[PDB]
Amino acid sequence: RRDWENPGVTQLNRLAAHPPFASWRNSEEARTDRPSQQLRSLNGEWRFAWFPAPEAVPESWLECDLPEADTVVVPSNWQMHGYDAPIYTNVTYPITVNPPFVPTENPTGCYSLTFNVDESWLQEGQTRIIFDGVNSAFHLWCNGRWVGYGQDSRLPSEFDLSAFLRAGENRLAVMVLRWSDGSYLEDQDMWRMSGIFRDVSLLHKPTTQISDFHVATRFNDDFSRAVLEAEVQMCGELRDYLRVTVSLWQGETQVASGTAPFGGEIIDERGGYADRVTLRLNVENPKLWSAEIPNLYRAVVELHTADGTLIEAEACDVGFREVRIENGLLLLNGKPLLIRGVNRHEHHPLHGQVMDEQTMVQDILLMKQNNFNAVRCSHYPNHPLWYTLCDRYGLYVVDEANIETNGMVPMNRLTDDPRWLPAMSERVTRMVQRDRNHPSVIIWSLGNESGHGANHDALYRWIKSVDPSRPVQYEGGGADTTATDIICPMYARVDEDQPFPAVPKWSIKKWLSLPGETRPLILCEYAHAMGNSLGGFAKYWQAFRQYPRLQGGFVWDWVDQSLIKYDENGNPWSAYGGDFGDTPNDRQFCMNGLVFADRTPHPALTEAKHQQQFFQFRLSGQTIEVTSEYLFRHSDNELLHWMVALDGKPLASGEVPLDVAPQGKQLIELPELPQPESAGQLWLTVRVVQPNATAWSEAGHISAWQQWRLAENLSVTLPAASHAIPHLTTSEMDFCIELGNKRWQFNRQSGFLSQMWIGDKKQLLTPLRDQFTRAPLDNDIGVSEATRIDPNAWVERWKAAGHYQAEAALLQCTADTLADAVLITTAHAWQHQGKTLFISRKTYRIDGSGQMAITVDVEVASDTPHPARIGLNCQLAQVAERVNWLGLGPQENYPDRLTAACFDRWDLPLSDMYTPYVFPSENGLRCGTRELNYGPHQWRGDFQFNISRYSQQQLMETSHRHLLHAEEGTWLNIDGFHMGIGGDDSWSPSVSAEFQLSAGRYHYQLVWCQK
């Protein structure tokens, strides 16, 4: 049979799901979480062979190793080993939509392993094999005999091997199919890979054993008392001497215990469960678990005899916390959460979808270090270790079933069909059975982008009945269907409604108060971090803090799914969709992270960190008011540092410890300051520093900051007297001005400053010209494609309007000599096909001091698409090591993404002024700048700028960062104004009106001088 083309068969001979087991045979090791000799890993070197279809696998493989197989590491995705290509498709299925069939050319991975077992395992007990993750479906044989089959690439599939085992060498043969009917439920937006990608193990349990256990914690009104209730189930022969004891430990101290024989309460007319027992433990003043203080206890479940012999033990970490929705609010331990969440796929640039402890830890540390307190398992149950880490390090988790049918038309075609209820059910039920005891899991999710089908309603109900301790959410079909306890839209905007038929995305503030609505609202996905993005992030935060029922959301997403490829040289580079010959593909849409694949942050990460701070501040006079947003912990590892600076120059600073209760406030009166009558703006910067290291941060970690302008002293003094006067030399073709060893040349045909010299040294490679466009950001492009243009996209709108192609017609170019200067006046019109898009009017005033003051007045046609920027650009001859500026920084910042940047004097190496987005675009801009220094040059004004060795033209024409080459000299883009970058989504225009350049008339001025 082709069990892989039949949704009614999702497994054969598979054992029931259950929470993590180790079959410890020693209570103290179980207590300590130490290794169990009854649980062995079979990870390591296996033998593998790839085939084009299951029909090509030779029968001989069942009995013996194929000489042509290779030895490979398991776990692994075979594409990562180069056997076939990974495919990056977003919504459209990677296979023909024809349920339940799959391609007859179905890549098949034949894995095998030779192994043996302890003699005692041949003697007695049950030995099972556990495959934590096999993508997408597989058949298993042991010593040539068929064992079973399994589907669901994201949950463990276990089989009893007891009767197949033999003395000596044994051989497993695992036939893995790339595609199966399970693939119709695995349409997540990510690389499409396959293989045995999570752990493989053997677990030796007794025949009379703990087959399942559920831990629940209920509380009194003030959480000062709890009842821990643990239902324990057994398999095997019941005997009157058996007992179960459940003990609760706080570290090495036993705090509570309960023992009882098997036999549950009567539950119906036929009696009760003779094979279960529920123990109830009273716990006084329990230490509560939260992401803020992940307090944990240890529960040890022992199956033993009345007379004291242990048969076996199981165990888990227990977090005492209550999750409930009441009055429209999601409460944890009675307090309303504010979710600083992120969606996180399991992705590694070299290993594909194989997760390792080091990586998970790294991600958790970075998440916490960047003020995240929650994660959504987009969009499947994760590797088991993730939950352990989240329980211990403390992050709220949304555990999500591995069901995504995005590519169907309409999206609920399968989810509304009863024939698919069975396969879907297991993806939900087996997840709960496995994960229900992890305290970090606070919400269950039914899957993602599968429309809204009756199967969802049935499953929603099943979970609510089986585990009332956690709310259930699901975004499909409109985000507020009968299958979700939380309104949980993806990409709904803060103030702006997007009233799509059937499934509108209302402004989140409006959504809450729709007639009859009362649920809390937490975005399952928001702030699409694709390339230069995160524009408008602060808008969300502000709303979340203002509206009780807006309880946060999960950013999309943590890490870019870029894959490493190698060039002819052996040099690695980041690859995206299509880079493997995969087609159709969705190009750079797999890169939406706050961090690059290797975990290096993108600039947007700081913006997120700042907006998600846990301390709020207000300034009044000299009093700084600090407000704690923590719900549970006191600020016991924080100090406030403050500093006052005059235009970058340090004037004063100090420190004061924070001593604020959760939700409390603290007033700090700044000492009396000094009075510098020296002109300039004074600025106050405060930072919260954690003096002590923690399990997730180093000593000195900065967790929050904020700045304010203090007194300003406008300069009223006149600059020193003009020693000299510059000379004008005219030709039909140029206006040349000379001053000392300095010269400026203005082309009279083009009307631009075409050259400048310090001595005989030329300073420009390209003339100084107005610039109205930018190499488009991913948000500017959306889903627009050459092949399939989206005319509504920003980029398309600017192309169609001719912005990229308009030519500067000269309207006027004059020169006047003044008393102590030369004044050049210019006027240009940029037109397109006869339409004048923009008019720039300028004056350049060069005086005896050698400074060139530029004044620019631009007019933009009201009917042309608002332009990406309004500035000047040129290629300087010079290449200098550093960039020093007085403005916002130090990192890249844009108008709608600069709240995290601070105003001060920064100085970085030039390359730091370039942001290496894998898909290149305008980047590295810094706003609010009053002075910029590079080499001998100094520009002053109130502008935005970027500076790098790459032209806007080069960035726009180059699809991968590894292909960029430094140009001669340095490209400087100085803007009077720059359009926001947007990001509410990356497939429709998202830059908010206030960050669009629509004023029609714009003015700016700059002074260019040397030194």
Interface residues toward Na ion, by CB under 5 A: 189, 544, 548, 550, 589, 592, 635, 638, 657-658, 920
Q: Are 364 and 393 in contact (CB under 8 A)?
A: yes
Asked whether position 638 contacts Mg ion by CB under 5 A, the answer is no
Type and span of the H or E element at 794: helix 794-800
CA dihedral 118, 121, 127, 131 (to 10 degrees): 0
Q: Are 203 and 21 in contact (CB under 8 A)?
A: yes
The one of a copy of itself, Na ion, Mg ion, none whose footprint includes residue 815, by CB under 5 to 8 A per kind, is none
The one of Mg ion, a copy of itself, Na ion, none whose footprint includes residue 825, by CB under 5 to 8 A per kind, is none
CA atoms of 454 and 477, how far apart (whole Å) = 11
Asked whether position 158 contacts Mg ion by CB under 5 A, the answer is no
Q: Which two tokens stand for residue 509?
A: 């503030």
CA 106: distance to chain centroid?
Answer: 32
The one of a copy of itself, Mg ion, Na ion, none whose footprint includes residue 550, by CB under 5 to 8 A per kind, is Na ion
The one of a copy of itself, Na ion, Mg ion, none whose footprint includes residue 466, by CB under 5 to 8 A per kind, is a copy of itself
Reduced to 3 states (helix: H, G, I; strand: E, B; else coil), residue 984 is coil
525 is catalytic: yes
Which residue from 353, 406, 611, 840 is in contact with Mg ion, where contact means CB under 5 A? 406
In the complex, minimum distance from the CB of residue 530 to Na ion, in angstroms, rounded to a whole number: 7
The one of Mg ion, Na ion, a copy of itself, none whose footprint includes residue 359, by CB under 5 to 8 A per kind, is none
Asked whether position 9 contacts Mg ion by CB under 5 A, the answer is yes
Length of the chain: 1011
The one of Na ion, Mg ion, a copy of itself, none whose footprint includes residue 638, by CB under 5 to 8 A per kind, is Na ion
CA atoms of 165 and 146, how far apart (whole Å) = 12
Q: How many residues bind Mg ion (CB under 5 A)?
A: 9
Query: What are the φ/ψ torsions at residue 974 (nearest 5 degrees)?
Result: -115, 120
CA atoms of 792 and 987, how far apart (whole Å) = 10
Whole-Å CA distances, 755 to 155, 171, 495, 749, 818: 66, 77, 48, 14, 22
Q: Which residue lies nearer to Mg ion by CB, 6 or 627?
A: 6
In the complex, minimum distance from the CB of residue 111 to Mg ion, in angstroms, rounded to a whole number: 19
Q: Which residue lies nearer to Na ion by CB, 318 or 332?
A: 332
Query: What are the φ/ψ torsions at residue 86 (nearest 5 degrees)?
Result: -75, 150
List, in sequence order, every beta strand (DSSP E) within 877-978: 882-889, 902-909, 926-934, 937-948, 970-978
Closest-CA residue to 182 (of 101, 76, 105, 78): 101
CA atoms of 714 and 994, how far apart (whole Å) = 28
Asked whether position 123 contacts Mg ion by CB under 5 A, the answer is yes
One of 312, 314, 346, 525 is an active-site residue; which one?
A: 525
In the complex, minimum distance from the CB of residue 465 to a copy of itself, in angstroms, rounded to a whole number: 4
Q: Which residue lies nearer to a copy of itself by CB, 502 or 720?
A: 502
The one of Na ion, a copy of itself, Mg ion, none whose footprint includes residue 123, by CB under 5 to 8 A per kind, is Mg ion
The one of Mg ion, a copy of itself, Na ion, none whose footprint includes residue 635, by CB under 5 to 8 A per kind, is Na ion
Asked whether position 6 contacts Mg ion by CB under 5 A, the answer is yes
In the complex, minimum distance from the CB of residue 416 to a copy of itself, in angstroms, rounded to a whole number: 9
The one of Mg ion, Na ion, a copy of itself, none whose footprint includes residue 526, by CB under 5 to 8 A per kind, is none
Which residue from 52, 584, 700, 1000 is in contact with Mg ion, where contact means CB under 5 A? 584
In the complex, minimum distance from the CB of residue 476 to a copy of itself, in angstroms, rounded to a whole number: 7
Q: Which residue lies nearer to Mg ion by CB, 185 or 839?
A: 185
Ordered DSSP codes for 814-829: EEEE-SSEEEEEEEEE
Reduced to 3 states (helix: H, G, I; strand: E, B; else coil), residue 913 is helix
CA 146: distance to chain centroid?
Answer: 42
Q: Which residue lies nearer to Mg ion by CB, 449 or 485?
A: 449
CA atoms of 388 and 440, how far apart (whole Å) = 8
Q: Which residue lies nearer to a copy of itself by CB, 64 or 266?
A: 266
In the complex, minimum distance from the CB of residue 964 to Na ion, in angstroms, rounded to a whole number: 9
Type and span of the H or E element at 650: strand 649-657
The one of a copy of itself, Mg ion, Na ion, none whose footprint includes residue 238, by CB under 5 to 8 A per kind, is none
List, in sequence order, every beta strand (DSSP E) within 527-606: 550-555, 563-566, 572-575
CA atoms of 593 and 841, how far apart (whole Å) = 41
Residues near a copy of itself (CB under 8 A) are: 6, 8-12, 16, 265-274, 406-413, 418-419, 421-422, 425-426, 429-430, 433, 449, 451-452, 454-455, 457-462, 464-466, 476-478, 482, 500-503
Asked whether position 958 contacts Mg ion by CB under 5 A, the answer is no
Which residue from 132, 158, 181, 780 is in contact with Mg ion, where contact means CB under 5 A? 181
Asked whether position 135 contacts Mg ion by CB under 5 A, the answer is no
Q: Which residue lies nearer to Na ion by CB, 378 or 893?
A: 378
Closest-CA residue to 234 (of 129, 305, 331): 305
CA atoms of 493 and 989, how far apart (whole Å) = 12
CA 877: distance to chain centroid?
Answer: 39
The one of Mg ion, a copy of itself, Na ion, none whose footprint includes residue 462, by CB under 5 to 8 A per kind, is a copy of itself
The one of Mg ion, Na ion, a copy of itself, none whose footprint includes residue 658, by CB under 5 to 8 A per kind, is Na ion
Q: Which residue lies nearer to Mg ion by CB, 182 or 776?
A: 182
User: What single-letter DSSP state applies at residue 968?
Assistant: S
Type and span of the H or E element at 62: helix 60-63
β-strands 615-620, 441-445 pairing: unpaired
- Does residue 261 have a cis bond before it (omega within 30 degrees)? no
Q: Which residue lies nearer to a copy of itself by CB, 11 or 855?
A: 11
Q: Which residue lies nearer to Na ion by CB, 626 or 839?
A: 626
Buried b (16+ CB within 10 A) or exposed e, 537-560: bbbbbebbeeeebbbbbbbbbbbb
In the complex, minimum distance from the CB of residue 98 to a copy of itself, in angstroms, rounded to a whole number: 14
Residue span 438-477 as binding mask against Mg ion, x where in contact by CB under 5 A, dash where not: -----------x----------------------------
Closest-CA residue to 773 (of 940, 967, 959, 973): 973
421-435 and 454-466 helices, crossing angle to 10°: 30
Q: Which residue lies nearer to a copy of itself by CB, 418 or 584?
A: 418
Q: Are 983 and 529 in contact (CB under 8 A)?
A: yes
Q: Which two tokens stand for residue 35?
A: 């290794």
In the complex, minimum distance from the CB of residue 449 to Na ion, in angstroms, rounded to a whole number: 11
475 is catalytic: no
Point out which span in 123-131, 191-199, 348-356, 612-620 binds Mg ion (CB under 5 A). Answer: 123-131
One of 312, 449, 607, 931 is an active-site residue; which one?
A: 449
In the complex, minimum distance from the CB of residue 317 to a copy of itself, in angstroms, rounded to a whole number: 25
Query: What are the φ/ψ torsions at residue 755 (nearest 5 degrees)?
Result: -165, 155
Q: Which residue lies nearer to Na ion by CB, 314 or 480?
A: 480
The one of a copy of itself, Mg ion, Na ion, none whose footprint includes residue 620, by CB under 5 to 8 A per kind, is none
In the complex, minimum distance from the CB of residue 468 to a copy of itself, in angstroms, rounded to a whole number: 11
Query: What are the φ/ψ torsions at residue 952 (nearest 5 degrees)?
Result: -60, -40
Residue type, 918: V
Measured between alpha carbons, how far apart are the two ends of the chain, in Å? 80
Q: Which residues share a beta bridge with 616?
A: 627
Q: Which residue lies nearer to Mg ion by CB, 603 or 776?
A: 776
In the complex, minimum distance from the CB of residue 705 to Na ion, in angstroms, rounded to a whole number: 16
In the complex, minimum distance from the CB of residue 400 to Na ion, in angstroms, rounded to a whole number: 16
In the complex, minimum distance from the CB of residue 151 to Mg ion, in angstroms, rounded to a whole number: 5
Q: Which residues are catalytic?
A: 449, 525
Question: Which residues of the chain form contacts with Mg ion (CB under 5 A)?
Answer: 3, 6, 9, 123, 181, 189, 406, 449, 584
